[PDB]
């Protein structure tokens, strides 16, 4: 079904617009392993992240064609869809580079 095209260490955040604050995705602070999964049958991509500790899925987001991926800093990247704003606070610049490369590749071939 789906192939992982990258793995990156990041704390996954979502933006609480009513309170103007970032909050941990899934409700629990800490780092996750964040994949981009490619579904080859229909050429779709998804961001799926799981907490290192307890394997909880904290993000499971489609990547639509035309997404604006904002590399705010070398270690915090973010994007939005029609409901939520997502942020990734990467564990290193290398993790940020790996993930942005895969994301940019996804956006090119979509």
């Amino acid at each position: 079904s789906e192939q992982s095209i990258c793995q990156a260490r990041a704390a996954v955040m979502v933006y609480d617009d009513a309170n103007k604050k970032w909050v941990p995705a899934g409700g629990s602070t800490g780092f996750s392993r964040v994949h981009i999964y490619h579904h080859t049958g229909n050429n779709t991509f998804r961001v799926v992240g799981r907490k290192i500790q307890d394997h909880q899925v904290v993000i499971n987001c489609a990547i639509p064609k035309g997404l604006k991926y904002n590399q705010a800093t070398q270690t915090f990247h973010q994007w939005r869809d029609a409901r939520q704003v997502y942020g990734l606070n990467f564990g290193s610049k290398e993790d940020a580079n790996v993930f942005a490369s895969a994301m940019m590749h996804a956006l090119e071939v979509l």
């Binding site: 904002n70 705010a72 915090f76 973010q78 942020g87």
Partner: peptide, 7 residues
């Protein structure tokens, strides 16, 4: 896009 988080 919102500013990046803090400590």
């Amino acid at each position: 896009x919102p500013p990046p988080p803090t400590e």
